[PDB]
Structure formats: C-alpha cells, structure tokens
Design a protein around this ligand. Structure first.
Ligand SMILES: [Mg+2]
Ligand SMILES: [Mg+2]
Lengths: 82, 154, 57, 114
RNA sequence: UUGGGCUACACACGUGCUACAAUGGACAAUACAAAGGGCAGCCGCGAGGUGCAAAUCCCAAAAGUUGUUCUCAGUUCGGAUUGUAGUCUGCAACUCGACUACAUGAAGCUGGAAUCGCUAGUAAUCGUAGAUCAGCAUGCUACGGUGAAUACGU
C-alpha cells in the first residue's frame, strides 16, 4: 500500500474535474484514463467513464468504493471460456 | 571402473571405543554431512545397549554385526534368455559394508520414537539373532542356497 | 413414572438434570456463558475509514 | 475447558490450547497469558478456577470465533457487491492477489480437471 | 503519447523451491569462513524512519555446540490461500512490486509406469556475495562451512 505519510494518490487533472462539478445537481460523466487514481469521498455520486485499454466503461461511485482505485472497476481482460 | 580397482580410504578409530568399525557406523548414520548428530546418536544408542543388556556396548555390537554379515550373496546375470542369480562369496570388506548398512537401514524402519532407541534395539535384537537386519541376512542366504546349483556361472 | 435425575443448581437457580451449594431454602445441591453489551463497535464505513486514515476531516 | 465457546484441548499447555480458538494464534495466545497472569506451561486440565476465569476475561476483549467470522465474511461480501477486481476473483474461485493462473493455482481452483 | 497486454486459465509437459517431521519444531546462550561490492553509493513488535573512493569504514554467516520444552498428533510438522493494518521504492503498486504485523491455516504422513545427477573436498547439506537493477531472483554466476557411501568387474 501507499505510505500514509504520502497521502492518497489522485491525478490532479481528474480531481479538478470532480471539483468543477461540486455544487451542482446535473452531474455529467467524467471521461478519464486515470485508472490509478484513488476514489475519494467527493467522488460519491459521480460517474467515471474509465478507459480499460480499448473503451471507457462507466463506473458509478457509491460510498463502499471509497479508497479503491478507479481501475478496480474497469476490467481489462476478457475471459468467459476454457 | 574399466581401468581397475581404486584405493580405499582409511578412517580413524573412534575416541571412546578405539574402534574403526564404530567410525564407519557413524558415517552410515550420518546424513547431509551432519557428523555431530550421527556421533550423538551412536554414543547414546551404545549407552542404551550397555544398560539394557548388562554388557559392554562394543562387545554386544560386535556380536550383533556378526549376526548380520552374510557369507553368500546372489549376483544378477544374463544367460542367453534366462536371468540367473549366481551365488557368490562376499568378500570380507563387503561383509562389513552390508552389516553396517543393513543395521542402520532396518533400525530406521522400526517403531521406536528416537533413532538412538531404534539403533540400540536393532543392536540388541541382532545380538540375539533376531530383528529386521538379521532376517534380511537370512533371506539373502535363503536366496543363495536356492541357487547353489548355479555356482558354475561367473 | 415407572420404577438418575435430581434438582441440581446451575447467577444461580434451581433446576432438574442428570449431570450431577447451600440455598436460602437451607439445603445443598450439586452446582463460561452473561451472553452479550455492544461487545465491539460496528464497522466505521469506507468514508470515515478513509478520512481517519489520512486525516482529511 | 470451554473458553470462547470452544472446548480447547485439555492435555496441552495453555499457549497451544488457546490457539484452537478462531482468532487466536501463537502471538495472541502469549499476550493473553501475560495479561491474564497464567503460566504458559500449565496444562489446561491443571488450570485453577481462578486462573481459568482470568483467561476468559482477557479473551473477552478480543474479536474471536463467530464475531470474527462475520466480520471477515462481510468484507468479502462488500468486495463482491461493488464488483471490484478482487470481488470478481472471489466469486470466480480464482486467486485474488495477482498470482499466476497458467499453473499453480490449485488451492483456489481445486483438484485438476483433465 | 496516454491506457491496456506481454502476468489470461478447463488443462498437458520441462526445470526448480518448500514440505510431509523427533537425525525434528519452538525458545535461550555461545563459536568458526571464503569470495566480492561501494559515490551522493555503502523511535516503532516489525518491515523501516530520523566513517569510508578502500588490506583502514560499511555491506556483514548458517549448518554447528550446549541447555529447556514439545511427545508421534495432519500436530507446537507444513505455510498454500484469504481478510485486515502497514513499510519502502517509484509521477504512479487496480490490472501487476517487494517486505512486515495480526488473524486464517489448504494439499501434503516419502510419492505408479518410468526417469536424473554424482567417483572426494565430489555427492548431499548450510549459509555468503555479485551482474542486471529506482523497486523487484525459489533463476544465473561465483564463494566458503560441514561432509559421506561405493567402484568386485566389463
Ligand atoms: Mg513472458
Ligand atoms: Mg510451524
């Protein structure tokens, strides 16, 4: 895990997108490539179209997802078989 | 090897019983070069022997080894479509090898918890003409005399 | 009943059983779990756990 | 005898016998017997009633047995409900900590199906 | 260039590591190496945090020995898997790093047909160092400690 002394990592460009919608009601999907950003408490209620390598898949954030990486909800490998 | 026989290595007599046979026994007991453990087992086993029998441990150990050492063995041979177990006489140096090897191998298969207990009981048993190592010698003679007709092969 | 089982004392209270102490009645009988307080606080929750871990109020 | 609802083995030393409780390992058992002043080498059939009572009170402060099983199961349930990467591996029966599955994942997968 | 993949997973094969325990496990005390590398490099239970450009300082022995305990139990063997909480590097450990602490405690009780290495300081076993390298070695290369059995013969 990331050192506590360094705090939780989020990409600055993604965080500004979340703060730009702060104080609104018609939230809009945030398209991002930042799979490595920690989900912060202010991400709750937001949708993130997260790149999985070929497409942006929607990730709607609930409270139980706080502290996880955005990439943990956009699977990158496809397997349904043998 | 094809060229010929190779010289063998001597060993020192053990510090307690002044016996080269005892040193060779420790080497058979020893695993992975751990000599101190092997020496500890051997000397503890000899204390058990000396008090469970009332005699000198070394004297019992020479009796036990004489009951394990075979005089005749069987050798494999291919004779034109029929494998023949030719009986041969064991040379004196190989007799000691088999005596020590069978004693340790059959002490390892016993049910006592510690090896010093297992080795001491094998020695006490073999000195009474019983036990696994004495049986293995008996089955070797029983395999040999069943083939003493084949002594004419080489 | 046809023709053991006595009144053993299991707090303390009289009872009958076979798995066989003076009482206010003045007689003696053969004598862990008090079952759960809140025991442990429930889970904090991810938001509170996040804020407390990094000191983010 | 019965400490946290479990009948710990009677013939063993307390430090060992306490580890038969779900939630207590070797290090926890050592600290429980330091807190509740009981010698580690006592056989639990030789524990006095007072010594046994002191152990049960210290053990009461630890999350063990069914309380610990509920907490662990709630954690796995949360991972599966939010459909995280780990939660998906939990439901699929696959390793969750990045281990390779081309070979040597038998513990999570079970016996081979040739 | 950003992100993903080279790390997938019903299986099959090769090479290894750790085990199945008492010649052992745990705990305490106490000895004995060789070969190499080094410049911005060499308080917390814990991982970790806050003199030397070299025969000079640092990296930095274990097996062993002596005692105590365990007592043949899938266990005080085994540490796979999983949960939680952390440390460090790195812009960044989700995919997909290493290590630590607590908890959990899988298969496994010497392995079919078959098959491999090794002739002496060798095999076996125990540690150590280096290259690559921000971080990552059960691999590779190298170093010492303990240290066998056997070779009748073609
Ligand atoms: Mg590859
Ligand atoms: Mg263990």
């Amino acid at each position: 895990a990331r050192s506590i002394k360094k705090g939780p990592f989020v990409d600055e460009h993604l965080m500004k997108k979340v703060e730009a919608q702060e104080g609104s009601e018609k939230k809009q999907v945030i398209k991002t490539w930042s799979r490595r950003s920690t989900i912060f408490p202010n991400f709750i209620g937001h949708t993130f179209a997260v790149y999985d390598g070929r497409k942006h898949v929607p990730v709607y954030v609930t409270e139980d997802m706080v502290g996880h990486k955005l990439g943990e909800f956009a699977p990158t490998r496809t397997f349904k078989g043998h | 090897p094809r060229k010929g026989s190779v010289p063998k290595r001597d060993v020192l007599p053990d510090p307690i019983h002044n016996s080269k046979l005892v040193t060779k026994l420790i080497n058979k007991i020893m695993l992975d070069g751990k000599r101190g453990t092997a020496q500890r087992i051997l000397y503890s086993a000899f204390d058990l022997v000396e008090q469970r029998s009332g005699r000198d441990a070394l004297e019992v150990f020479e009796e036990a080894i004489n009951n394990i050492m075979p005089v005749l063995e069987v050798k494999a041979r291919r004779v034109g479509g029929s494998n023949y177990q030719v009986p041969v006489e064991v040379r004196p140096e190989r007799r000691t090898t088999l005596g020590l090897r069978w004693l340790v191998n059959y002490a390892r298969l016993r049910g006592e918890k510690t090896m010093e207990d297992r080795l001491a009981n094998e020695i006490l048993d073999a000195a009474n003409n019983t036990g696994g190592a004495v049986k293995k010698r008996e089955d070797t003679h029983k395999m040999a005399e069943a083939n003493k007709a084949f002594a004419h092969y080489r | 009943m046809k023709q053991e089982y006595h009144q053993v004392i299991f707090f303390k209270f009289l009872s009958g059983s076979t798995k066989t102490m003076e009482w206010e009645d003045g007689k003696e009988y053969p004598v862990d779990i008090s079952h759960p307080r809140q025991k442990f606080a429930a889970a904090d929750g991810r938001v509170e756990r996040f804020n407390k871990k990094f000191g983010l109020k | 005898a019965r400490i946290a609802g479990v009948d710990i083995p009677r013939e063993k030393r307390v430090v060992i016998s306490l580890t038969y409780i779900y939630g207590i390992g070797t290090s926890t058992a050592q600290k429980i017997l330091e807190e509740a002043n009981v010698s580690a080498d006592t056989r639990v059939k030789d524990l006095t009633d007072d010594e046994l009572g002191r152990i049960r009170e210290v053990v009461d402060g630890y999350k063990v047995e069914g309380d610990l099983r509920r907490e662990t199961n709630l954690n796995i349930k949360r991972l599966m409900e939010i459909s995280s990467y780990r939660g998906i591996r939990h439901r699929r029966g696959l390793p969750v900590r990045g281990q390779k599955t081309k070979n040597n994942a038998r513990t999570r997968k079970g016996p081979v199906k040739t």
